[PDB]
Amino acid sequence: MNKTDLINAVAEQADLTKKEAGSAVDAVFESIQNSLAKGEKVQLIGFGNFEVRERAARKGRNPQTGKEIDIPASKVPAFKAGKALKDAVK
Amino acid sequence: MNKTDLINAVAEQADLTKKEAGSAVDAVFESIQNSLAKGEKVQLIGFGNFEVRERAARKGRNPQTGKEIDIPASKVPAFKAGKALKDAVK
């Protein structure tokens, strides 16, 4: 299922024009992105949580060389599924 | 941002009533949950992918009996962030 497929599912289930569902789906994910960009956690009851995980600078190793490498600090997005999603998948 | 806040953000950006936005938000998460429940990946350009990850079957030991046990394989939700979401938080 890709974004267009998802927009068609929303149009159908929420009874919206394809254009309105398109606007809504764009808004959902841009809102989650804009929240995480400001460091704010997203808590979606009955789906899951989005947050930003911080990792510090670090020493590591290239898989193919064996060389010591510097691993810089990073901020990456993280998703934590909730029970409804976990139970439906298992 | 919680689900109520997300619905309000969606109503604002997509210019929908709070009830329309609430229906759309519910439809997105229901449709992602339903896709993954069928083992089907959700590919959202820019944002990322929701997939099903299998945890392999494995062997354990009962600490009482000392006998080998079988831990069955299981499926869990997984999320893999895309370039737009990663670049928004780095």
UniProtKB/Swiss-Prot annotation, chains A, B:
Keyword DNA-binding listed = yes
List the source organism: Staphylococcus aureus (strain Mu50 / ATCC 700699)
Q: Subunit arrangement?
A: Homodimer.
- GO cellular component terms attached to this protein's record: cytosol
Name the GO terms of the biological process aspect. chromosome condensation
- GO molecular function term, any single one: DNA binding
Function statement: Histone-like DNA-binding protein which is capable of wrapping DNA to stabilize it, and thus to prevent its denaturation under extreme environmental conditions.
The protein's name is DNA-binding protein HU
Q: Which PANTHER family match?
A: DNA-BINDING PROTEIN HU, DNA-BINDING PROTEIN HU-BETA
Record keywords, A-Z: DNA condensation, DNA-binding
Query: PROSITE patterns from the entry?
Result: HISTONE_LIKE
A Pfam family that this protein carries is Bac_DNA_binding
